[PDB]
Amino acid sequence: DLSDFASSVLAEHNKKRALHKDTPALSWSDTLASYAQDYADNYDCSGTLTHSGGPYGENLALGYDGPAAVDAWYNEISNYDFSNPGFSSNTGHFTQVVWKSTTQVGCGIKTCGGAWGDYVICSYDPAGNYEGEYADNVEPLA
C-alpha cells in the first residue's frame, strides 16, 4: 500500500489529468520515487532550483507541500495558447503534468523550513516536453 504522501500526490495529478480529453491516469512508481527522494535528500536549502540532469522528466518546486506543488504547476494552463502549441518558461510544468504519453510518476520531499519551506521534486517516465510533439500530447479540456 502507498504512503499518505504517495497517495495524495498521485490523486492530485490524476484529478487534473481527468479534466483533459484522451489523457490516461498515471500510476505511482517506487523506482521513480527512490530517484526523486535521493535527490531531495541532497538539496542544500539555498533557494535555487537546479535540475538533476537524469534520465526522467522532472518538475521542481519550493515553498509547497506535495499536492500544493502539483496545483501550482497545473495552474500554468492559464498562460498556454492551444492554437500555438509548444514550450514556454511559464507553461512547461503544466505540459508535463498532462503529457499524454507519460505513464508513471514518483516524487520526493525535504523540509527546509526557514525562508524556503518544503522542497518537492516529481520524476516522470516517459518524459514530456519533446519538441514537435506538443499538439499530440497536450489535449484541450473535456
Author numbering: 158 to 299
According to the publication:
Two crystal structures of the CAP domain of pathogen-related yeast protein from Saccharomyces cerevisiae, Pry1CAP, are presented. Our previous studies revealed that Saccharomyces cerevisiae CAP proteins are required for the export of sterols in vivo and they bind cholesterol in vitro. The overall monomer surface area for Pry1CAP is 7125 Å2 and its topology is an alpha-beta-alpha sandwich made up of 6 helices, 2 disulfide bonds, 12 beta turns and 1 beta bulge.
Electron density for four 1,4-dioxane molecules were observed in the initial molecular replacement 2Fo − Fc maps when dioxane was present in the crystallization solution; this density is absent in the Mg2+ structure, which does not have 1,4-dioxane in the crystallization solution. Density corresponding to one 1,4-dioxane molecule was observed in the 194 Å3 volume cavity created by the CBM, confirming for the first time the ability of the cholesterol binding site of Pry1 to bind a ligand. Since a 1,4-dioxane molecule binds to the CBM cavity, and the CBM is verified to be important for cholesterol binding, the effect of 1,4-dioxane on cholesterol binding was tested. 1,4-dioxane inhibits in vitro binding of [3H]-cholesterol to Pry1CAP in a dose dependent manner. However, the inhibition was only observed at relatively high concentrations of 1,4-dioxane, and is possibly due to the increased hydrophobicity of the 1,4-dioxane containing solvent compared to the aqueous buffer. Mg2+ dependent sterol binding by Pry1CAP requires the interaction of both binding sites, likely occuring via dimerization, because Pry1CAP forms dimers in solution, and both crystal structures have a crystallographic dimer in which the CBM and CAP tetrad are connected within a large 7063 Å3 volume cleft.
